[PDB]
Amino acid sequence: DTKISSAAILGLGIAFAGSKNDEVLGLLLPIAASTDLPIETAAMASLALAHVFVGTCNGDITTSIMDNFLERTAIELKTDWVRFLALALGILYMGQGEQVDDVLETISAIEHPMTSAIEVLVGSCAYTGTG
């Protein structure tokens, strides 16, 4: 069942280091921002943004990625994707202005679920500490 999605991610896949296109987020973001959309495919997509936009980051990227984070059902924990999701909220930042500090503050704002994994992990990485 070779879904058309393949042909899509394929083209963009080459546009990775292309020259920064509006098609990347114009297709990936939606697949992981619209409202829900499959978490699996969206997972690999989220990473694509990180590595790519590894340099310049934007809030809209996080905000959207956050909306989906909440929509979580905690029932699909069966499929693997929590790793990429986490690493994303991490590699994303790297120090600039108590940015991450605010993030951890939000996660706590809405109770304290199994998000512990993120708290600790993301908690470790923040200020200067990697040379």
Binding site: S34, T35, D36
Partner: protein, 76 residues
């Protein structure tokens, strides 16, 4: 006017509509072209989801507008 509909794949469908045309009507045209049923479409523009009944005029949707065709929680 001639409006365009970008699919979540890369293909862009061009359809000739009017400013009074109702969204529901547009969705119908898309169903006749592709095969997606109305109860399975989500048109978005400038970061704003369009609701049925309304018209392409209630969203300032002029000509040559690239409507973002998103799937409202695709089944599979």
């Amino acid at each position: 006017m001639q409006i365009f509909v970008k699919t979540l794949t890369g293909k862009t469908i061009t359809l000739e509509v009017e400013p009074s045309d109702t969204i529901e009507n547009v969705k119908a045209k898309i169903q006749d072209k592709e095969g997606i049923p109305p109860d399975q479409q989500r048109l978005i523009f400038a970061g704003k989801q369009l609701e049925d009944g309304r018209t392409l005029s209630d969203y300032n949707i002029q000509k040559e507008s690239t409507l973002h065709l998103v799937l409202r929680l695709r089944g599979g």
